[PDB]
Design a protein around this motif. Structure first.
Motif, short mmCIF file in Angstrom:
data_model
loop_
_atom_site.label_atom_id
_atom_site.label_comp_id
_atom_site.label_asym_id
_atom_site.label_seq_id
_atom_site.Cartn_x
_atom_site.Cartn_y
_atom_site.Cartn_z
N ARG A 265 51.58 21.24 51.17
CA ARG A 265 51.28 21.41 49.74
C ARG A 265 50.41 20.28 49.25
O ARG A 265 49.39 20.53 48.61
CB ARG A 265 52.55 21.55 48.91
N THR A 266 50.78 19.05 49.59
CA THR A 266 49.97 17.86 49.28
C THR A 266 48.61 17.90 49.98
O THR A 266 47.62 17.41 49.45
CB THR A 266 50.69 16.58 49.71
N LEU B 35 46.93 20.72 50.85
CA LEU B 35 46.16 21.68 50.08
C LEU B 35 45.57 21.07 48.83
O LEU B 35 44.40 21.30 48.56
CB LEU B 35 47.00 22.89 49.68
N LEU B 36 46.36 20.30 48.08
CA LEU B 36 45.88 19.78 46.79
C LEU B 36 44.77 18.74 46.98
O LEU B 36 43.86 18.64 46.15
CB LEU B 36 47.05 19.24 45.92
N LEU B 37 44.84 18.00 48.09
CA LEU B 37 43.80 17.03 48.43
C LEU B 37 42.52 17.70 48.91
O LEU B 37 41.45 17.33 48.45
CB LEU B 37 44.32 15.99 49.45
N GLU C 160 41.58 20.59 47.95
CA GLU C 160 41.03 21.15 46.72
C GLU C 160 40.41 20.08 45.83
O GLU C 160 39.38 20.32 45.21
CB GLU C 160 42.05 21.98 45.95
#
Lengths: 194, 193
Positions: free
Chosen positions: A58-59, A61-63, A65
């Motif tokens: 999840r972390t 993915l956010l990075l 993005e």
């Protein structure tokens, strides 16, 4: 205009993106080449984090993005405004294939996140460099790089699904030799370019 | 259990959260105190980036959420599993108030992103330390800190909006002195501890 390369590790994206860069430059297009993650100062530190740290999906993915967002706003959107040809080594399909089909996260959420990061900026054409995993692995092996066969099979299937479902995706047989693969790319681009 | 402090800069969030941390450790709870962004190794490096670099609002939101994602998975979730009291100096309402009501990103989208970063982990109670911007500024001004009144006025309205619609948000009159604000927080926390 915007040309996205997509594919698994070992599919030759970096090499083919560079070839396309040099070739379009010589035909008189103004062209940029960026990699994901990275392509900006802030994107590149995030690339280092993504490559070195033990991150949950999840972390991670956010990075990815966040790197994309920085690149879209700092460079791609202005580049495109000035009629540059923008070539990406990886883009929104890779995120869905890796984080969705590979790591199990929700595909519709990933797409919504992609849309946010991109401000709705979509490629004119997406080149999927498709290659079998064992051949991809054998090439990576030549640079002393070892990636996960089980993971990459799911990712490859993700990519081929997305090429059916998504718009403007051409599947390139990337198992070929460097020049023959490049030639196949040029043919797929001739229906949008020179 | 999970206790979240929310509010504008100058509302005294950190001071109150440290007071709550010290108090509950005295009364025999095992407690954690974390700040957002930060609180993990990776989250502190992202905090550095957020505090220095020139960032668009979209990149900024995504980095706030990445810090949160790391802290949630690495620490909050385990801490809660072992019945620690987790106190947070800023959490999901601050992201909505600042990035949504403040900078104009979509509030509903931010909510969904929060939901993703947290794995649906919600605070048992949220303490909104509400204060007028003038007074928050007057207090910040005496630490050589200057923030945008126009910006912060929008963000305050956002915080109060969210208190009316969101669940488990007690609005604490944070305009008072340190001890009377802490007394109010303790009152608010009696209904969960």
């Amino acid at each position: 205009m915007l040309i996205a390369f997509e594919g698994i590790d070992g599919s030759g994206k970096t090499t083919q993106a560079k070839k396309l860069y040099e070739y379009l430059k010589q035909k008189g297009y103004f062209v940029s080449l960026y990699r994901e993650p990275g392509g900006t100062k802030v994107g590149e530190v995030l690339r280092e984090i993504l490559l070195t740290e033990e991150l949950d999906e999840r972390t991670e993915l956010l990075l990815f993005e966040a790197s994309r967002s920085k690149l879209i706003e700092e460079k791609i959107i202005p580049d495109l405004k000035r009629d540059k040809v923008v070539i990406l080594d990886r883009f929104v399909l890779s995120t869905i294939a890796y984080q969705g089909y590979g790591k199990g996260l929700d595909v519709e959420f990933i797409k919504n996140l992609n849309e946010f990061a991109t401000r709705g900026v979509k490629p004119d054409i997406t080149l999927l460099l498709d290659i079998p995993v064992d051949i991809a692995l054998r090439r990576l092996k030549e640079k002393n790089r070892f990636e996960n066969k089980e993971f990459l099979e799911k990712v490859r299937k993700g990519f081929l699904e997305l090429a059916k479902e998504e718009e403007n995706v051409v599947v390139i047989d990337a198992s070929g030799e460097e020049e023959e693969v490049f030639k196949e790319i040029l043919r797929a681009l001739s229906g949008v370019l020179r």
